[PDB]
UniProtKB/Swiss-Prot annotation, chains A, B:
Inhibited by hydroxyurea, leads to dNTP depletion, replication fork arrest and genomic instability. InterPro entries: Ferritin-like_SF, RNR-like, RNR_small, RNR_small_AS, RNR_small_fam. NCBIfam families: PRK09101.1 (NF006576). Provides the precursors necessary for DNA synthesis. Catalyzes the biosynthesis of deoxyribonucleotides from the corresponding ribonucleotides. R2 contains the tyrosyl radical required for catalysis. The keyword Oxidoreductase applies. This is Ribonucleoside-diphosphate reductase 1 subunit beta. Its cofactor is Fe cation. CDD domains: RNRR2. GO terms for biological process: 2'-deoxyribonucleotide biosynthetic process; deoxyribonucleotide biosynthetic process; nucleobase-containing small molecule interconversion; ribonucleoside diphosphate metabolic process. Keywords: Deoxyribonucleotide synthesis, Iron, Metal-binding, Oxidoreductase. It holds the Pfam family Ribonuc_red_sm.
Length: 340, 340
């Protein structure tokens, strides 16, 4: 079972990242993995408040935009808001019960916290461009075109969360619950975790970035500049979050942290590959609904599609997966002005 | 049955604080209880970086302290560290899965995050006043005296978490798990949450404050100035935290939220009372250890006992409970200088 304070004095430097003894003392003078303490420090140094960003001229910019451009901007915004909503709570509820080293535990809480700030920034933006925010917020839950990735993303988390509860409550083995057999396997739980993480890595590394291009295209035209300044800050944060998930995944697949996970990851590589391509395909299909009424300056269905493949190749290679698309240089180098 | 993004489009203004539909969209343009949005805003405005606080003068001060005074200081510090370690993760793991309104969800995450900053501040303090932090950190886990004073905190959170898992997995009813009859009652789970909340309130409003007094006793002597600045910053945050729990509890008691919670608050009021009485006694019993090698001018077992009764009455009155201790004036008015 899970405990908020394991009474056993353990060497936190020897525990695996996940599934070891629950973290008792929160100390930051040492760590098994330096990267996580460095990320906490960086994230704290980047603290920012949405309210301190002037977005007063974004309202007029939005109203003056052609209808299809309003659609593009607002549709993209709703999706970003959806992703931040999930990322604000999910890392905590899903990972906290499985972490066994203090630096990773606090990094996850810090990572999640920074996501709630992003959520607050989107409320700030929405309240300053539509007059009646409720219209926007409600269409997030029910929007068909958006509620497909949410289902897929939330699914990975929910299944991991469910299996984690069974593991903590019953432990490994073949159990029975109300006439049904319930098998609890640590190997499968480990695979499930490797899956949220890969999926979360694609979310942080691909899904968010594709939306940033959608957003900075306006900035390039000196429009929605308040929104742009906020996205710049958010993007600076996401870079840290993806760095964190990339290290977690690489440490798990290399075999140094947990040999069993390395074994499991090698076994489900084809699955992770398809999982990544699937994510990229969903982002591509979205371009349709986004540019169904037309495209805009420096951005269209084809360009975005190219960008998705460009970014995906990079991210997948970073975690040891084969490249699914043809290699080529950045289709939209101008994006670098707003990112890194 | 828990989900990271419920697909049902619900009116978040009509959900109860707890046990309603899990929060889907994180919006901050409106709230059922604006007090939580105000608390998030205030906590964000108080953001501080522990490492920025100059504690270089603390090593000299500490080493020059009489041995019994070093024992008092460090023992107090180790307990505070324990409480922050627990408070950094528990709010998230125990409450997050049960919150049904966005403002409360984010407040809990913000509250927990601020506690991790406090934990980081203690590492900063420890690392700068002793040769080997590991001895201090390891003693926290062991040391029967410290765990004696904290006995009941981790255990309560753990019970709630386990019951919550059963609820999410099996739902309401009487079940058969591995041949054993397991009862899952929402009413009983609500009681567990309610009493956990009262326990955290006692933790936030009493346990932390009795420790601040010991810390500020050194500040009064012009010693441990760095630690003092940090404690003032921590105390400022704890004031928001206890304001948060007091409001949660009193809102539940009012009957304006979940009607059943109002019933429960009334039914278990003796439980609430007993919790404080027990916590106060634990804080008092800690005196024998704290002063085992001797006391200090203005800080001894008697004064500690008097302050515990003083503050406990204040906190209990704040949530509608009878006062167990004889009324008295502040036994250490010099603390005001350092608080609020
Ligand atoms: Fe974000
Ligand atoms: Fe992120
Ligand atoms: Fe704290
Ligand atoms: Fe607190
Ligand atoms: Hg996931
Ligand atoms: Hg795009
Ligand atoms: Hg995989
Ligand atoms: Hg994958
Ligand atoms: Hg594409
Ligand atoms: Hg393409
Ligand atoms: Hg509790
Ligand atoms: Hg004290
Ligand atoms: Hg009760
Ligand atoms: Hg009560
Ligand atoms: Hg007393």
């Amino acid at each position: 079972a899970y405990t908020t304070f394991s009474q056993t004095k353990n060497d936190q430097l020897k525990e695996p990242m996940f599934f070891g003894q629950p973290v008792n003392v929160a100390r930051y003078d040492q760590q098994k993995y330096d990267i996580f303490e460095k990320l906490i420090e960086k994230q704290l140094s980047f603290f920012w408040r949405p309210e301190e960003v002037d977005v007063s001229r974004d309202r007029i910019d939005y109203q003056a935009l052609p209808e299809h451009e309003k659609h593009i901007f607002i549709s993209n915004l709703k999706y970003q808001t959806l992703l931040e909503s999930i990322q604000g709570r999910s890392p905590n509820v899903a990972l906290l019960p499985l972490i066994s080293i203090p630096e990773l535990e606090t990094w996850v809480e810090t990572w999640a916290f920074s996501e709630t700030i992003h959520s607050r920034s989107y409320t700030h933006i929405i309240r300053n461009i539509v007059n009646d925010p409720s219209v926007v917020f409600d269409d997030i839950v029910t929007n068909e075109q958006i509620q497909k990735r949410a289902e897929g993303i939330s699914s990975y988390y929910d299944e991991l969360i469910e299996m984690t509860s069974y593991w903590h409550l019953l432990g490994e083995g073949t159990h029975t619950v109300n006439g049904k057999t319930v098998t609890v396997s640590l190997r499968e739980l480990k695979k499930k975790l490797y899956l949220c993480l890969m999926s979360v890595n694609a979310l942080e590394a691909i899904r968010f970035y594709v939306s940033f291009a959608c957003s900075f295209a306006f900035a390039e035209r000196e429009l929605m500049e308040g929104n742009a300044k906020i996205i710049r800050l958010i993007a600076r944060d996401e870079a840290l979050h993806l760095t964190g998930t990339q290290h977690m995944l690489n440490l798990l697949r290399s075999g140094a942290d947990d040999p069993e996970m390395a074994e499991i990851a090698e076994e489900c590589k084809q699955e992770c590959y398809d999982l990544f391509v699937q994510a990229a395909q969903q982002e591509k299909d979205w371009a349709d609904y986004l540019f169904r009424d037309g495209s805009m300056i420096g951005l269209n269905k084809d360009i975005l599609c190219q960008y998705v493949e460009y970014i995906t190749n990079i991210r997948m290679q970073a975690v040891g997966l084969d490249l699914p698309f043809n290699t080529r240089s950045n289709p939209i180098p101008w994006i670098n002005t707003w990112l890194v």
